[PDB]
Amino acid sequence: PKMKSHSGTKKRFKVTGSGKVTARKAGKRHLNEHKSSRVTRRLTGETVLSKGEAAKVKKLLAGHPGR
Amino acid sequence: AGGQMPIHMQAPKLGGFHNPFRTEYQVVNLDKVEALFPKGGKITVDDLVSVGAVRDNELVKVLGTGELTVKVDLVVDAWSKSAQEKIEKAGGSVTK
RNA sequence: GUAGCGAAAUUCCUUGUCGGGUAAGUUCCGACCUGCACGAAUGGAGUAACGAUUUCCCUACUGUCUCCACCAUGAACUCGGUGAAAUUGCAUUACGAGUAAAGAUGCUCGUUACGCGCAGCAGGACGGAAAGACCCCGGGACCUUUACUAUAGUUUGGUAUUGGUGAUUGGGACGGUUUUCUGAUUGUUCUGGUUAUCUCACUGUGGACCGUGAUCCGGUUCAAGGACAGUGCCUGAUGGGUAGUUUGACUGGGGCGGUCGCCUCCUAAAGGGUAACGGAGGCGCCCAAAGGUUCCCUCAGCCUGGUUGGUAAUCAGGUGGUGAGUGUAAGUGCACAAGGGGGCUUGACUGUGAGACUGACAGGUCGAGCAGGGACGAAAGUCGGGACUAGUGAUCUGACGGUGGCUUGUGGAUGCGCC
RNA sequence: AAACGACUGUUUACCAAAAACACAGGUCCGUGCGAAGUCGUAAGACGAUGUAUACGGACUGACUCCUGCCCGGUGCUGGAA
RNA sequence: CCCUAAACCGACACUGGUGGAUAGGUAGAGUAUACCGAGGCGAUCGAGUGAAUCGUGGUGAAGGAACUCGGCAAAAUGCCC
RNA sequence: GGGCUUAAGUUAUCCGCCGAAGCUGUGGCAACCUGUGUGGUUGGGUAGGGGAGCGUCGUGUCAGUGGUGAAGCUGCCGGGUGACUGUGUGGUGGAGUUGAUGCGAGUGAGAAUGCAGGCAUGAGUAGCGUGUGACGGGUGGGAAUCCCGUCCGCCGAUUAUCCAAGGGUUCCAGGGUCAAGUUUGUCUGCCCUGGGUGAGUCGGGUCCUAAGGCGAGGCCGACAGGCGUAGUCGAUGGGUAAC
RNA sequence: GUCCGAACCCACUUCAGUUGAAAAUGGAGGGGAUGAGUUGUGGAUAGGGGUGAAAGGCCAAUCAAACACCGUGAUAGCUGG
RNA sequence: GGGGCCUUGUGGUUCUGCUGCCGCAGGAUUGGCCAGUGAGAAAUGUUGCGUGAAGGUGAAGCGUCUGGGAAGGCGUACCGGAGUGGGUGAGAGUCCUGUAACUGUAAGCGUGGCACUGGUGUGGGGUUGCCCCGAGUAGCGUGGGACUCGUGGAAUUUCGCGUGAAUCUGGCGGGACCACCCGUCAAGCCUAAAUACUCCUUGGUGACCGAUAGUGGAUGAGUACCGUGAGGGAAGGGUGAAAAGUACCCCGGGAGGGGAGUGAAAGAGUUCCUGAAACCGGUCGCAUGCAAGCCGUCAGAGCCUGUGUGGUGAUGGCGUGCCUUUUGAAGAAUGAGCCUGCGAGUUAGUGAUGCGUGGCGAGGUUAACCCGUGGUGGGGGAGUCGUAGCGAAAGCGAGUCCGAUA
RNA sequence: UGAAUGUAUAGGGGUGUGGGUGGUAACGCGGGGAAGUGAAACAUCUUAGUACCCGUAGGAAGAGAAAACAAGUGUGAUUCC
């Protein structure tokens, strides 16, 4: 049978043109008042995963190209 | 992950949405057009770019990375501004 | 906490104390009350009779014993027949003092010992039998309850079954008395609450009759109820009656106690890092100034003089470099002040981030330069909160504001996305 | 002679026969009969071919003398501004 | 045909369990017990041998619970008038 | 440990030797690096990673081979760095199977208190299930254990006799001694063959009902089903004619 | 629901057995033995249920939820191989 | 849309009543386009085909050699629309059974199809004025279920309980809802084929098993046996080509053996092919009764043998099992009495992701299915991956996104 | 024929007209409907509408001739791949 892809991984991770795995930075959904604009700038970007985490995400995606 | 909140839970969900009616433009470049129609392709068409390679039964947008030293009449579905500018500079045209 | 009872089937201390019994009595039985922690239908205190119940004593009686002996028998033992069992890494399987996974037939150093049988005894082979029944850890089961979430049942009201006619009580329709109105209303319709009636709805019932010569059942009828009850659906309450489950870890075993994230110091062995239920403390804030900027100032202590006034309030002179101070722990800092004061302000900005620091990662931290638009300063310039480092919470889901990217035939709407 | 249970009985087949259970007696609560209670989805049935001197539940446990104070908590019963 | 069993229930040709009927004599209250009757059996490995020891019985000087957690077991008592 | 001071004790110092799978010499194997004439470095190893193989079975193809003896089994003589092996040589055996090269695996066992069978160990050991047998004669290949007889002992509210339940041919006669019988056995409740059970009255049915079961219709229940009327069964009882 | 005591029913003590004669018995005593007695035959109650003079006892020789089959090759961060 | 209202049209008529002495309908052998045993508003005899169940025919070899036996060897011929097998005393194309090919089928309830018989039967155009078009239904509320959708922005669909419509200028659907547009006409019914399956029947097949395997079952197998019952549930295959199964004699009561016969073989004698290991013995060689032994190993005398290598081994040195699990085990931690057999990394996906290798290459590749009853081959490009990325997306595009066209 | 009873029905008496009963390996349709398991606990969810169960077929069944899709043209019953 076909292998299903992981739903959370589908919704959370992207794969770039060069095979890099990127996610959205965590920690900016709420409780933003005490955070400086510098902290929000650090948390508003797009993070590139480490090699091990990227391999795990690629295993979780059943060939799904990411969101 | 051993009980630690796993990456696929700690990372925030990329939100957004998908366009239900999004169409994807098969793209051909001026490098490829020049290479596959070197003898000054007079009137290239969707069928001609398909017999070369455009993956037919799709819209056949033409993009403009290249030089296009020849004169060519593209007759395709949509084109980029730089591609159009290069085409009229070389002396060709686009249609549709 | 009464009557009564009490070192008791209850008394920890405890062999309480006294008295009886014995030559000697932690037991006994009668008392004391100092009841750790009696007590009146989970009955209190008694009680003739009863007890293969528990306890103490006397007598009789005895191999229970001093202290065993002897006799006969079924096994044991020899011969003939028949003929298992658990167990089993191995074998030509000593002792001593050692050594080693800390208890050796098997290793070391020594000592002793001819080969093989038979009857015996149980010190060892950590002997055999049962993947310890205690302990802990994982799982399960059943039990309990004011654990959680449900549920049968019981119960509430609505509504359907469900109709007829009334009164007695509230809200309008509605005009046309009042006085559209603070206040009164009536009639003409409409709609709630409450309540009493009526009866080929219904009740599964009391009598009679018939199916039938049947204590079932049904039908007819009478009586009694009666739109109630019953039942369906919806709904609130109740519900260990029942069901599924949860009930953390660390830990010099576990339990109890304590602890769990963040910050500072020491341990920490002069980079960084470094554990213990190691040694000390803090944090879950605060401040519209205690932020920004610009200019100005120097403290604490000590000595002397001085109304109230004293060690110490305010004042003067002298001395005094950090020992004062710092919103808040501690350290590193800060007198060039980052400490004290005045002026003007909102940078406690928007768009950014070269380049680095630090973590397994999520992440945490610093940051030049630039644009916009400001504050302060004559300018140089400084300003993306606070001398620095704690004052915090990923994701999910939902919410508000803005934006308008998307919207399933189109236009809206609605929903979503983005910030 | 003391403790316990009044007694005869009953009980852990296969480690406990007892001071445990039962018991006669006692009290409280429920039940007006299609009873309450119980089995069952229901019809039915037991209760009972019984009718409050009965039936069901609870605790106590022959007999003698007795059974005190507390309704704040919880439960039950009644009441409904 | 077996049938208070070698034939049934116990895996056995198993010192266990299995309902009913008949059931004489003497001693005796007796269907207890002893020895016998009607009738039936000698039991399904034997032969020996004074070992220790274990089981099962027997007797015991003087003492008489000194035993032991405890008079456990045994002994004594026992019937009729 | 023996023993040692007459050091074989301590200490300073000198001269020798012993001593490892270390080093060196010699011979073989292997991995890697290197310019590729040389040479250099390396080769303990659990978990584990990489590489290259042995053996078994099936199978495509080619070459074959086999009663002048395949497979299997079992000796001897050999071979390889290993799993293993000989195209050496016998024995047993009686119908298949070898080499090359591919292909496919139910492809390798010493452990799982593993499963099945066979067989050891304990061991000629414990036991042979309450007891009283003795003798004379007989039978027989064989007799404590079979038959007959005589003594003796045992049971006798049962070790007797007859039923029910249950069993099912064990009953009788004759033949038998592999197995079974806790020994032996000529014997048997065993084996083999044949035979044996006679009812108007006995015990049941043809008669009766109890508890209880089933239950025409029926009532109840989503279905499945529950209950129950009329009935109809059901002895452990009633009724019923022989000694 | 008297007394002593056989049958009968029981199971208090002790010894033996404990690879037993026996997966609970045997020897010696012991309790009840006209009663809430005991026993034969047939029947009824069934597994979250039965029944229980109540021990969580018993329900076909292991019952804090029987047995058989099925879901099923349940699952096991554990032990073994 | 239909009914109605009309302008016409019914198969050529014997020539009946009614509507108007117009027309309508019954009528009757006869055409007849047709249509038929089907779901089709229906269902009743005679004639044309190859066959299934049984059968029939079915080609073509001898001679020598060794052997118990020829299918083997050697020589030499034949058949083949037949060389697929399986038998026969060993390995057969021509010995047997068959096979190829052809043929028969009477019969079937036969069956399928054809003819006939027989049985059954037209519309087109206009027209709104009217009439009809499936009701406790659709909807709505509520409590549940199914839809990717787990109550939600909740369409569509469904059950219980309430409530309850329009009906053509109408109803429903197009994911709340409304409008328009597009589609469609629910609340009546029947419908072959492609699809699923095998207790059975017939034929065939297997890099499937070969008696601990394969069914539990190659045999009295759901049997023996166990359980009250539901239920559980085995083990045991092989003489030889042919019984020619050992006449007769001897020891023995027999059992068993010894002679002899049968047979190629009897050490193939029925417990019978082959006959391994554990295990149990006889014989021979050496060692062993002064010795402390994880049982071996290295050194090594003597003896035996010499089939000149082998067997044995006095005596000396060194030396604490295997596995598991462990910081650490000879361990007095676990498991194993012994041998033989059996017993654990598999398989399936046009799964995911690497690598090796082969093909093709800016292209690669098919899936279902169709053809090949002749297979493993050919077709099939629907799809799918590569061919452009960036963005939540509109979109833009070698750029894009955040941003101010920074 | 017609009860109570008036209509009449229930019922009763004929007649025998037709059908039913039960079995069956898989496949079908309609309905009822687990748990172990997974989620490293667990309750939503999962397992799974699976196991099992009830009713009921046929040689196949079910479905089926648009109150359908589509999205601007169009497709034209259902089933299956």
Ligand SMILES: CON(C)Cc1ccc(O)c2c1C[C@H]1C[C@H]3[C@H](N(C)C)C(O)=C(C(N)=O)C(=O)[C@@]3(O)C(O)=C1C2=O
């Ligand atoms: C007074 O402390 N002493 C030392 C203990 C002890 C003393 C005398 C005994 O007579 C028994 C015991 C222990 C228990 C253990 C029980 C246990 N069970 C209850 C879970 C168990 O696990 C088994 C078993 N079959 O494994 C049993 O044997 C068991 O039931 C039983 O019977 C026991 C006895 O007999």
Ligand SMILES: [Mg+2]
């Ligand atoms: Mg947000």
Ligand SMILES: [Mg+2]
């Ligand atoms: Mg902010």
Ligand SMILES: [Mg+2]
């Ligand atoms: Mg956590």
Ligand SMILES: [Mg+2]
């Ligand atoms: Mg005292």
Ligand SMILES: [Mg+2]
């Ligand atoms: Mg005390």
Ligand SMILES: [Mg+2]
């Ligand atoms: Mg005293």
Ligand SMILES: [Mg+2]
């Ligand atoms: Mg009181």
Ligand SMILES: [Mg+2]
């Ligand atoms: Mg009280």
Ligand SMILES: [Mg+2]
């Ligand atoms: Mg008390």
Ligand SMILES: [Mg+2]
């Ligand atoms: Mg009392």
Ligand SMILES: [Mg+2]
């Ligand atoms: Mg008292």
Ligand SMILES: [Mg+2]
């Ligand atoms: Mg008393």
Ligand SMILES: [Mg+2]
């Ligand atoms: Mg007593």
Ligand SMILES: [Mg+2]
């Ligand atoms: Mg005395």
Ligand SMILES: [Mg+2]
């Ligand atoms: Mg003896």
